[PDB]
């Protein structure tokens, strides 16, 4: 689906400095808007830059054995400064996400990463009658995240009971080592309501699985790191409660 061919190497280093953050993106161009919609305001307190700035999660090692990785939103960013706060001090909250996944290697490494953003991504446990099942804490692995396997999400079953090959229905991009180094996914707020409670309900779900294995030239770096930078877009929350300071 993502049959693009920007250039191949590197051209232009154009940094995204929003608020306090700074990114220095590989370029800027080549981004996918989920379903063709930009995160908009409810048609409330709009913090903007205060909440709307780049936060970086923990970097994870990609290896010749890796089966995949997964995170939840806003869940992961629950331990992020002002966005971490505003999440616990309000009963409401809707937010967009600029999932900017970067992965650098050399002209000598080969493989392919597919960043899949699954809206309402519940994980594997074939009890249709009683879903949710796995405890609040397991279902929410924070900023460190969870991982796929060959709480148990099977890779070819996308960790939900449906053949991986059809995953390509959800918004995605393929970080193919020989071409792109970056993945840009703007995910607008998707839920059954106009606004809801962030602490309990998980909107999206970033799942990066390997479509091609990792092969490194003779002897080189045994593993390569993948980084996930996420940012809250056009967010609002109602309404401050006894700023119950922890």
């Amino acid at each position: 689906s993502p049959n693009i061919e920007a250039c191949g190497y590197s051209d232009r280093v154009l940094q995204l400095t929003l608020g306090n953050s700074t990114i220095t993106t590989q370029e800027a161009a080549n981004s996918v808007v989920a379903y063709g919609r930009w995160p908009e305001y409810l048609r409330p307190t709009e913090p903007d830059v205060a909440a709307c700035r780049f936060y970086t999660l923990d970097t994870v090692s990609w290896t010749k054995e890796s089966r995949g990785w997964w995170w939840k939103l806003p869940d992961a960013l629950r331990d992020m400064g002002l966005f971490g706060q505003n999440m616990y001090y309000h009963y409401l909250g809707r937010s967009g996400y600029t999932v900017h996944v970067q992965c650098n290697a050399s002209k000598f490494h080969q493989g392919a990463l597919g960043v899949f953003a699954v809206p309402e991504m519940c994980l594997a446990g074939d009890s249709n009658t009683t879903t949710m099942h796995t405890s609040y804490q397991n279902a929410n692995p924070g900023e460190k995240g969870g991982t796929f396997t060959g709480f148990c999400p099977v890779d070819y079953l996308l960790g939900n009971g449906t053949l991986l090959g059809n995953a390509f229905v959800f918004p995605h991009q393929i970080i193919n080592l020989r071409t792109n180094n970056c993945a840009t996914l703007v995910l607008p707020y998707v839920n059954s309501l106009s606004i809801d409670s962030m602490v309990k309900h998980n909107n999206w779900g970033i799942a990066i699985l390997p479509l091609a294995p990792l092969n490194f030239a003779s002897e080189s770096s045994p593993e390569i790191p993948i980084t996930l930078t996420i940012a809250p877009m056009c967010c609002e929350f109602n309404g401050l409660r006894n700023i119950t300071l922890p």
């Binding site: 049959n3 080969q110 090959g165 059954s192």
Partner: protein
């Protein structure tokens, strides 16, 4: 009373009818709908979305992620295609498990064009050329490069561009084709061969893979709604 006459068909129940019946909850405030991104209008739209084909459904590789990994190994230049595929939807186990096929198992016919996209997943430095070939319906499977070369084929270069897109046209006898196994209306073949060979510098792993995708086009349509659900 107004003279009325009851004709045949009264008191019967047509499952597929369309009649105005009494509304059980008068004045009920229905919650207004919001523009939740991703509204679908028709099924054909889900087909125009490229979906990865599980090419290698071998004994061990089927029902595992390996079914999606077509590996270009280090073997002799034998005009034996690296991969061949039948353009026969439900009459071939490979095109069936695609989102495209998943739409076709709910109809009897299918028309229009289809597009196969191959994405190479090897070292930047690695180079070579391959020949993606198409053989129209009824024609025998192209088993040699020379054979496959004569027909509609694209000479896809690995060295330059990473992704090839070959749009399979509408070369069909009937205006509407069978989604079932029929000889009167049988698909054809899409096969890949070593135009050149694979050239890798230094000591970079000599075996990489290629992924495949399939989707429909604007002219792709379906008919006669049927089902197949078991217990």
């Amino acid at each position: 009373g107004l003279p009325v006459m009851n004709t045949p068909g009264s008191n019967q129940y047509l499952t597929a009818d369309n009649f105005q019946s009494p509304c059980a909850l008068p004045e009920f405030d229905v919650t207004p709908p919001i523009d939740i991104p991703g509204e679908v209008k028709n099924m054909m739209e889900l087909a125009e979305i490229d979906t990865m084909i599980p090419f290698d459904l071998s004994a061990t590789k089927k029902n595992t992620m390996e079914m999606y990994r077509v590996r270009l190994s280090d073997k002799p230049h034998t005009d034996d295609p690296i991969l061949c595929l039948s353009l026969s939807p439900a009459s071939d186990p490979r095109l069936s498990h695609t989102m495209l096929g998943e739409i076709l198992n709910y109809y009897t016919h299918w028309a229009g064009s289809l597009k196969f996209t191959f994405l190479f997943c090897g070292s930047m430095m690695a180079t070579g050329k391959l020949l993606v070939s198409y053989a129209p319906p009824g024609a025998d499977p192209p088993k040699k490069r020379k054979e496959a070369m004569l027909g509609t084929h694209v000479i896809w270069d690995i060295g330059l561009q990473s992704s090839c897109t070959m749009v399979v046209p509408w070369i069909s006898n009937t205006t509407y084709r069978q989604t079932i196994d029929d000889s009167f209306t049988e698909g054809g073949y899409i096969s890949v061969f070593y135009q050149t060979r694979i050239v890798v510098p230094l000591s970079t792993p000599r075996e990489m893979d290629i992924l495949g995708f399939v989707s429909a086009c604007n002219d792709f349509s379906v008919r006669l709604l049927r089902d197949t659900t078991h217990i």
